Amino acid sequence: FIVDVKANKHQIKQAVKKLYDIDVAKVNTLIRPDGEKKAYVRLAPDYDALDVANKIGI
Amino acid sequence: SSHKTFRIKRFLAKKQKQNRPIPQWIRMKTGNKIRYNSKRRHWRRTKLGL
Amino acid sequence: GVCRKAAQPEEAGLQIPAILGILGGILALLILILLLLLF
Amino acid sequence: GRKRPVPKGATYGKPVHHGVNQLKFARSLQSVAEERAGRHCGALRVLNSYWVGEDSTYKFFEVILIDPFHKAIRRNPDTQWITKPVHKHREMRGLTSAGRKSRGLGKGHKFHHTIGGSRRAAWRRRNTLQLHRYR
Amino acid sequence: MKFNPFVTSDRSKNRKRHFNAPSHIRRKIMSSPLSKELRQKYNVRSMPIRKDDEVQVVRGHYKGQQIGKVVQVYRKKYVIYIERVQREKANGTTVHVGIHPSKVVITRLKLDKDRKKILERKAKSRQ
Amino acid sequence: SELAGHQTSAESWGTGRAVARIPRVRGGGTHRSGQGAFGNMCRGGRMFAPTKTWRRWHRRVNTTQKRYAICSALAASALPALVMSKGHRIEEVPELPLVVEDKV
Amino acid sequence: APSRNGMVLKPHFHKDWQRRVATWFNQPARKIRRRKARQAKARRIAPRPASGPIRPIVRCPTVRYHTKVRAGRGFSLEELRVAGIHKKVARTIGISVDPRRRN
Amino acid sequence: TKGTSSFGKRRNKTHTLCRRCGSKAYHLQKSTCGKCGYPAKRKRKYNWSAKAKRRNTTGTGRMRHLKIVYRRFRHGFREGTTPK
Amino acid sequence: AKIKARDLRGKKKEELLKQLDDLKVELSQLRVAKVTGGAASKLSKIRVVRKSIARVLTVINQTQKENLRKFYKGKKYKPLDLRPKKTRAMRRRLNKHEENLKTKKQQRKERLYPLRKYAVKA
RNA sequence: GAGCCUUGAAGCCUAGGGCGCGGGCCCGGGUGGAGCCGCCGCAGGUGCAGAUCUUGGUGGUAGUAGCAAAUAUUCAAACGAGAACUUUGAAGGCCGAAGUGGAGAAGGGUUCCAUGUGAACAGCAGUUGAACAUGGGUCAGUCGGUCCUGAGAGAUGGGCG
RNA sequence: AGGCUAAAUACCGGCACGAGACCGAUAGUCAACAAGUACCGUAAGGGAAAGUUGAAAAGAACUUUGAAGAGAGAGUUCAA
RNA sequence: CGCGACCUCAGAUCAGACGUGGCGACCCGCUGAAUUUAAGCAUAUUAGUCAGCGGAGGAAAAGAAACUAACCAGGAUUCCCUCAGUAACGGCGAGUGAACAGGGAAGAGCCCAGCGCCGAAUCCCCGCCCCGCGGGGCGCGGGACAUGUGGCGUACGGAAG
RNA sequence: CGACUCUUAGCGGUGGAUCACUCGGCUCGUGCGUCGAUGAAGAACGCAGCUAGCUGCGAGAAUUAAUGUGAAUUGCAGGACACAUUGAUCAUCGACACUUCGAACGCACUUGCGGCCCCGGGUUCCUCCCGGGGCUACGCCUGUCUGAGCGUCGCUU
Numbered sequence A: 001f002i003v004d005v006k007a008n009k010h011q012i013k014q015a016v017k018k019l020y021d022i023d024v025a026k027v028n029t030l031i032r033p034d035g036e037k038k039a040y041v042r043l044a045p046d047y048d049a050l051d052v053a054n055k056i057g058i
Numbered sequence B: 001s002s003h004k005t006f007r008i009k010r011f012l013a014k015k016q017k018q019n020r021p022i023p024q025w026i027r028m029k030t031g032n033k034i035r036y037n038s039k040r041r042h043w044r045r046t047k048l049g050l
Numbered sequence C: 001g002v003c004r005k006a007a008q009p010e011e012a013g014l015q016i017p018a019i020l021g022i023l024g025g026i027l028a029l030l031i032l033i034l035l036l037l038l039f
Numbered sequence D: 001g002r003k004r005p006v007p008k009g010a011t012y013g014k015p016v017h018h019g020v021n022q023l024k025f026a027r028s029l030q031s032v033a034e035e036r037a038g039r040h041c042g043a044l045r046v047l048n049s050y051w052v053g054e055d056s057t058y059k060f061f062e063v064i065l066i067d068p069f070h071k072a073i074r075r076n077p078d079t080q081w082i083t084k085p086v087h088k089h090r091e092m093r094g095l096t097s098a099g100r101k102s103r104g105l106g107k108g109h110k111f112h113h114t115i116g117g118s119r120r121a122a123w124r125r126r127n128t129l130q131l132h133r134y135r
Numbered sequence E: 001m002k003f004n005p006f007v008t009s010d011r012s013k014n015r016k017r018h019f020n021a022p023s024h025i026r027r028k029i030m031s032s033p034l035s036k037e038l039r040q041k042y043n044v045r046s047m048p049i050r051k052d053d054e055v056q057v058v059r060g061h062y063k064g065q066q067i068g069k070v071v072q073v074y075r076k077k078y079v080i081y082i083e084r085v086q087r088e089k090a091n092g093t094t095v096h097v098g099i100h101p102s103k104v105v106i107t108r109l110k111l112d113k114d115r116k117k118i119l120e121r122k123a124k125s126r127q
Numbered sequence F: 001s002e003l004a005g006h007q008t009s010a011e012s013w014g015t016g017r018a019v020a021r022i023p024r025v026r027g028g029g030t031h032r033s034g035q036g037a038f039g040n041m042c043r044g045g046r047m048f049a050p051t052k053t054w055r056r057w058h059r060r061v062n063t064t065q066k067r068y069a070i071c072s073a074l075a076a077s078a079l080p081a082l083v084m085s086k087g088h089r090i091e092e093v094p095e096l097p098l099v100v101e102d103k104v
Numbered sequence G: 001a002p003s004r005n006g007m008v009l010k011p012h013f014h015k016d017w018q019r020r021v022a023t024w025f026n027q028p029a030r031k032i033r034r035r036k037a038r039q040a041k042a043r044r045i046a047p048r049p050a051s052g053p054i055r056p057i058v059r060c061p062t063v064r065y066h067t068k069v070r071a072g073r074g075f076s077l078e079e080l081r082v083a084g085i086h087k088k089v090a091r092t093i094g095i096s097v098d099p100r101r102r103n
Numbered sequence H: 001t002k003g004t005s006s007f008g009k010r011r012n013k014t015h016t017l018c019r020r021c022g023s024k025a026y027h028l029q030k031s032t033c034g035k036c037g038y039p040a041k042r043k044r045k046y047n048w049s050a051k052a053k054r055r056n057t058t059g060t061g062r063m064r065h066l067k068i069v070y071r072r073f074r075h076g077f078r079e080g081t082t083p084k
Numbered sequence I: 001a002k003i004k005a006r007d008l009r010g011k012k013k014e015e016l017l018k019q020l021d022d023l024k025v026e027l028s029q030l031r032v033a034k035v036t037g038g039a040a041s042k043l044s045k046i047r048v049v050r051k052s053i054a055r056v057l058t059v060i061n062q063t064q065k066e067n068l069r070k071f072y073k074g075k076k077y078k079p080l081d082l083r084p085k086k087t088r089a090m091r092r093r094l095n096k097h098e099e100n101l102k103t104k105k106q107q108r109k110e111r112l113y114p115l116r117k118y119a120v121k122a
Numbered sequence J: 001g002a003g004c005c006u007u008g009a010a011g012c013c014u015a016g017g018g019c020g021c022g023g024g025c026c027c028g029g030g031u032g033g034a035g036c037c038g039c040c041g042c043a044g045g046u047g048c049a050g051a052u053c054u055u056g057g058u059g060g061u062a063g064u065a066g067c068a069a070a071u072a073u074u075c076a077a078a079c080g081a082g083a084a085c086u087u088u089g090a091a092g093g094c095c096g097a098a099g100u101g102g103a104g105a106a107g108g109g110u111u112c113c114a115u116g117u118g119a120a121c122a123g124c125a126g127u128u129g130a131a132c133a134u135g136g137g138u139c140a141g142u143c144g145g146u147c148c149u150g151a152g153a154g155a156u157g158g159g160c161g
Numbered sequence K: 001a002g003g004c005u006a007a008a009u010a011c012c013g014g015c016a017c018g019a020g021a022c023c024g025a026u027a028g029u030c031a032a033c034a035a036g037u038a039c040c041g042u043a044a045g046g047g048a049a050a051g052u053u054g055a056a057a058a059g060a061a062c063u064u065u066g067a068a069g070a071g072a073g074a075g076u077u078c079a080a
Numbered sequence L: 001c002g003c004g005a006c007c008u009c010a011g012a013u014c015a016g017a018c019g020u021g022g023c024g025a026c027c028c029g030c031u032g033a034a035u036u037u038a039a040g041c042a043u044a045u046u047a048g049u050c051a052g053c054g055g056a057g058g059a060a061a062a063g064a065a066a067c068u069a070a071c072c073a074g075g076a077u078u079c080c081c082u083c084a085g086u087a088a089c090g091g092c093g094a095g096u097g098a099a100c101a102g103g104g105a106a107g108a109g110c111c112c113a114g115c116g117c118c119g120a121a122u123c124c125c126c127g128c129c130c131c132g133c134g135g136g137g138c139g140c141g142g143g144a145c146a147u148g149u150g151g152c153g154u155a156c157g158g159a160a161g
Numbered sequence M: 001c002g003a004c005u006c007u008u009a010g011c012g013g014u015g016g017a018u019c020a021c022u023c024g025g026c027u028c029g030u031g032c033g034u035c036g037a038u039g040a041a042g043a044a045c046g047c048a049g050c051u052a053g054c055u056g057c058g059a060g061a062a063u064u065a066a067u068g069u070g071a072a073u074u075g076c077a078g079g080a081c082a083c084a085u086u087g088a089u090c091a092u093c094g095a096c097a098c099u100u101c102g103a104a105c106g107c108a109c110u111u112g113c114g115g116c117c118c119c120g121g122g123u124u125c126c127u128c129c130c131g132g133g134g135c136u137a138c139g140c141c142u143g144u145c146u147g148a149g150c151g152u153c154g155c156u157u
């Protein structure tokens, strides 16, 4: 995901749950050199990234 | 310099946002006489200096 | 595009090496050669 | 009296100005005390001041300060002139008792040096060469 | 002769206010006269234009007795476009041709509530 | 003009640096650096001894001459050969000094 | 620098006078301002006359000017007491009161 | 070894972007600013350089509040809203 | 559909909240469409959706501000933004009542010596 | 001046016709596309060869000097309109571990990588590149900053101004 | 040796505003244009060049050489 | 030894309020040169100006005589024409340089300390009602200032009884 | 004879002078005379469907509301075309809102380190635990509270 730079890792970990109703294993972040924040979110081993991608549209 | 403080990355981020040419639908507007980015920057000839 | 790229040199600056170069600076070399001129 | 702040007695000028040790600094010491009190407490307004003591080196003044925004002074309309906002920092524009006496203003033949307002205003009107449409 | 001290005879200021007036003044500038039968019927000299009138051209290359409908109004270009007035390019694509609305005679209006109110204001002021 | 053409700062180069002894702007990179500074014979310098807003514009005339000229102009307006020799059209006009009624 | 038989000139121009030149160009505008101020004063008062306070009869003070006579400032409270009227009542009536004047 | 050989030993910058005027004069080794004078309270300006005033006085930037100061002065600071 | 402020002023804030939630859902889904390819028609829709998001927050703050005024009204010591802004010199002017307040000496002076109307020609 | 002009003014050119002793002018011809002049008065930032004048442009010199520090290339094939330089193979060489290698600090700021173009830029050329255009790439409790004090710098208390 | 106070008065900053025997893009503010912009210097600071198609883009369809630039026909308009 | 009263004092993220920073064309307070002039240069002049610093408003500053004058006397301040390139200053050189009379524009005067008389008759803060809006001002009870001096009457033109 | 060179002239190219135009300057004058702790001037960063500048704006980001206006903006799609609902665009702007630095204010600035109070979830609670909000700069004034003094003094042991 692409996140605004004010948000930290705990707030991303809460926001992904409170929008998509799926757990968060852990969160890596980096500052993409264009200026935004690129956040990798690993899901729980129960869920499916393919199903979540199909249900968010990508 | 491969590790640098955060203000420098915001500055370099806005400069990478600046460094891009003119889209073509602006060139055919009404009353426009802009033909190219005169403010275009090449990384060998001009150095911004932080 | 092809037409945009072919256009792009004709507008792309043409006078950024018109930094003009030839401020030059100071001499201090021609007269250096001490000929002495009647020491 | 004040010592001229140039280092090592070096004026860099004519023999008019080599006098480092002897300058007296026009303003009076009472107005100096008023300036320091006012700009240390710039929230207040300076009314006047007076002498209380001197021994060798230190000279002692007492300065009365009027509060601008207390209600006892914002009422009682004989006093509202200092609450009116043209009197911020009277001591630095020299409107006090010692300030007028330092600026040197009166009436008559002993005061032609400042004919109206101040010596700079007098200098302005005297050396402003005036030119009309018709001459 | 100009008698106000608050309006300009100045050519520079007049051209500048003209070419930089906003859209709700450009409506008043792009105004057309009405035909003489309609000005007899309504007692009004001129009106602003809109998308839906019936329009005859009085001068140009395209002159006379061709009462067509307007379709677009570029207030940016001070130009209306008329449905009959066309010209092909080289590649056989038709394009509308620019007509300034001073060269335009209105034969029918589009009736609407605000147009009735503007028309009644014109008649009441002409008195 | 009323303001400087001396917004630029300038110095000369001297006997060395062959070109001239005009003051020159000091800088680099921007290609005005090394052009002609303030002066008359240069690009973007002040005009010679420039116009000043205290020029003696208005002039005074004596009041007796101001009235004398009015009397002379009214006297010249009475003769027909003078006013036709200015360029008016008085060929089919009645009397010279026209005088209509106060109903006008 | 001088020449043939010509008068000695000492003009006062060595001081940088071209900086501080105040020039009468707003003189007709000030005349119109002061006309509008006087007409505004006349409309803002009432029945009270313009140049409202009356002025005394006063002789100049110089062996040069003492033949003449001048509209003075005020009525010299001794005179105003002989008139039989109070002080500030005269200021309200429009009678000028200047207490420094001696008779 | 005075010119082009000794230019190559330039590696340490002595000016960084100061946080007040953004104009690259924050001299680290004195911990101050050159242009605006940041560790001082008052803003640095001088009469002996007119072009510095011409670059940094008001009117150059947005005046993003001073605009609406003028726009409210043009009516005189109303506090009601309008009638319908 | 269109979300007019005139319609929104009668609403309750708990329904404004849910309506804003639905609008931000539309915002995020059409922004996913903005990232991915096939979105030729949804982009004017994302513009009208974000301008609709602005209106509801405007109505909410318009309600909350005057609802705060309705119970600080008639009170001393109401807060700073609800105090009159105007400008700093107009805050620090005296008062109309302190302006018109007069001492008893000046009052008795005006009572004894009032200003008259007169005229002098005859 | 009931001045002149879209039936063509200003400006420009002219082996054209003339005038004046000249300053200069008038007409003809051609370009040119929207304003111009005569006279009487009036007011000027009012007439160029130069000032190692200023700015802008172009010559002769001249297709000349010059593309020479560090040994060096050759054959075949491929893609291509086009190969002394691109890529692959083979061969011969150099750097020879204090390197023309493998990685970093300061500095640079996207040059990193892929795809496409070869108009300008690479001082020859180029299918190539660090050129241009499109689109990607930098993930840390345990690597470092953050924390500590050093040489020092700096605030309140105080003093001076 | 304590104090207050309008007027007439100065104003090249600002806010709008009106005019001119002023300059007409090497002139006039440095800035008629993306001007305190590009750019130079570590910095104080220095600081440009650059207006004009046509009435209307009607901006050359299509053919035909050439790898393309470029060209020859054709076409637009009063004029390419 | 404890407690109480003050007097000097500190503290607080005490309740409420205020000052800082900017623009600086004009104004106000200080500080303050030098080029140049004098054909040299030291006083003079450039000038109490450029620069520096601190302040302020729509204007500021000034201001109701410890005045001008010397005769038939004027009468706060400000600004203009005159005074005047004068009286005067000056290696009595270069140079510098006022003011009152006069005529105009605008017109405006006032308060307090002191002195004494009135039983502190005065002000601030808190709390309740009072009232009507676009929004805050008089009155009633208790906490303070204040007798080392609130307020009324009072100003050199006399004032009080 | 050709080539070369020279001079004219026609044509063509390089070049951008003259002329003509001007949403620009300069000067004069009138009218007004307004910044900031309720966070100014300035700076940074960000914002459009296609978007780099300029311009305009601030997580409501090419503008929100409201009043007037009355059918568009425009380079191209789309989208609301609704108007016998509320009505496009543009101007006015008085209600909202106003990221970070900046006098900058919790202490410094490296986006670092905090401290209380309060509210939602945590171990259903303090013991250096997540999210959110508020408060936490200096100086000074009026009053409150706390208390120092072999300073002066009383009553008392």
Ligand SMILES: O=C(c1ccc(-n2nnc3cccnc32)cc1)N(c1ncccc1Cl)[C@@H]1CCCNC1
Residues within 6 Å of the ligand: C029, C030, C031, C032, C033
């Ligand atoms: O390079 C030069 C050099 C030589 C001549 C000129 N000149 N003289 N008149 C001139 C006119 C125009 C241009 N140049 C000119 C300039 C420089 N050198 C040098 N040699 C001898 C004396 C002085 C120098 Cl500096 C170095 C020094 C060490 C040995 N290697 C060479």
Ligand SMILES: [Mg+2]
Residues within 6 Å of the ligand: B047, B048, B049
């Ligand atoms: Mg640089």
Ligand SMILES: [Mg+2]
Residues within 6 Å of the ligand: D095
């Ligand atoms: Mg005073």
Ligand SMILES: [Mg+2]
Residues within 6 Å of the ligand: D135
């Ligand atoms: Mg004369």
Ligand SMILES: [Mg+2]
Residues within 6 Å of the ligand: E010, E012
């Ligand atoms: Mg003009």
Ligand SMILES: [Mg+2]
Residues within 6 Å of the ligand: F004, F006
């Ligand atoms: Mg000058």
Ligand SMILES: [Mg+2]
Residues within 6 Å of the ligand: F004, F006, F007
């Ligand atoms: Mg200068």
Ligand SMILES: [Mg+2]
Residues within 6 Å of the ligand: F005, F044, F045, F046
């Ligand atoms: Mg110039």
Ligand SMILES: [Mg+2]
Residues within 6 Å of the ligand: none
């Ligand atoms: Mg001689």
Ligand SMILES: [Mg+2]
Residues within 6 Å of the ligand: G010
């Ligand atoms: Mg002499």
Ligand SMILES: [Mg+2]
Residues within 6 Å of the ligand: G014, G016
């Ligand atoms: Mg001089």
Ligand SMILES: [Mg+2]
Residues within 6 Å of the ligand: none
């Ligand atoms: Mg034309």
Ligand SMILES: [Mg+2]
Residues within 6 Å of the ligand: J037
């Ligand atoms: Mg002629």
Ligand SMILES: [Mg+2]
Residues within 6 Å of the ligand: none
């Ligand atoms: Mg001619």
Ligand SMILES: [Mg+2]
Residues within 6 Å of the ligand: J044
């Ligand atoms: Mg001229």
Ligand SMILES: [Mg+2]
Residues within 6 Å of the ligand: F048, J045
């Ligand atoms: Mg000349």
